[PDB]
């Protein structure tokens, strides 16, 4: 009926072996308890479509995550249940995402955390490209998961305004070869880092979608501000990510040589204590 693979063991399981502990999203996501082991997991319910080429597209995506167990920086999938109407996708529970951390913080996430985040997300994206030939296409804070153990992982969860699309994805310069590649995700990462480092959307004061898309195309990229004490290597990293000319934008292997990443690979940062200190903080 469905198989859950948890901790090297494959359990036969039915949809009723899952006890519902409530919703986590707002497609629908539930916190559930697998009755056989007691594990508390995250489960996404999606409607299946009548288009069997679209069902194939989404199962191909999940196939990738199912085979991404050897990447420490990609959220773990335990398996799926398929009915006529629905696909249930079961994952390790991560406590929250960087989008919800920002709203709880009401302000910036510190650089030492974003440094660790950056190492994890770049390595996850690189892994997806190198091992599975796959581009994420939707890098943004709501797809960056954090937990109590200090892990940071890439997922796909499903005035001022959000916009994460690279210029070449908004408006391809070559109509003959219109496909954006991995550098579009590099840009999205840059935008995500600026948003999380500042606590504010980088593109500000926008009336319409057409205005916002227009801003990305003609404005200078919004870099980290220079008055907030950000390290030179962090500013350089973000600026390299937010190169408008995609032909000049670094690929992942180049980003993995950047000083910012090298520094945060080996620096001890207690993300777990910070995360907990954040969740337990009683000053408003
Ligand atoms: C902001 C989020 C939030 O509020 N919360 C609250 C708590 C919740 N925790 C949690 N923990 C684990 C999982 C989860 O949500 C889910 C996520 C997935 C999931 O990540 N699915 C996938 C699917 C596909 C991919 C890879 N694709 C490659 C192709 N491209 C397009 C071409 C798309 C991506 C991935 C990836 F990237 F590899 F990781 C992930 C599934 C189910 C659930 C429940 N929430 C977070």
From Swiss-Prot:
Comment on protein domains: The DVD domain (residues 377-400) contains a conserved docking site and is found in the mammalian MAP kinase kinases (MAP2Ks). The DVD sites bind to their specific upstream MAP kinase kinase kinases (MAP3Ks) and are essential for activation.
Protein's recorded name: Dual specificity mitogen-activated protein kinase kinase 7
Shown part of the complete sequence: 103 to 403 of 419
Biological processes per GO annotation: apoptotic process; cellular response to interleukin-1; cellular response to lipopolysaccharide; cellular senescence; Fc-epsilon receptor signaling pathway; JNK cascade; positive regulation of DNA-templated transcription; positive regulation of ERK1 and ERK2 cascade
Start and end residues of each Protein kinase domain: 18-261
Active site: 138 (proton acceptor)
Function: Dual specificity protein kinase which acts as an essential component of the MAP kinase signal transduction pathway. Essential component of the stress-activated protein kinase/c-Jun N-terminal kinase (SAP/JNK) signaling pathway. With MAP2K4/MKK4, is the one of the only known kinase to directly activate the stress-activated protein kinase/c-Jun N-terminal kinases MAPK8/JNK1, MAPK9/JNK2 and MAPK10/JNK3. MAP2K4/MKK4 and MAP2K7/MKK7 both activate the JNKs by phosphorylation, but they differ in their preference for the phosphorylation site in the Thr-Pro-Tyr motif.
Species the sequence originates in: Homo sapiens
Similarity-based family: Belongs to the protein kinase superfamily. STE Ser/Thr protein kinase family. MAP kinase kinase subfamily.
UniProt key word Kinase: yes
Record key words, sorted: Acetylation, Apoptosis, ATP-binding, Coiled coil, Cytoplasm, Kinase, Magnesium, Metal-binding, Nucleotide-binding, Nucleus, Phosphoprotein, Serine/threonine-protein kinase, Stress response, Transferase, Tyrosine-protein kinase
Cofactor: Mg(2+)
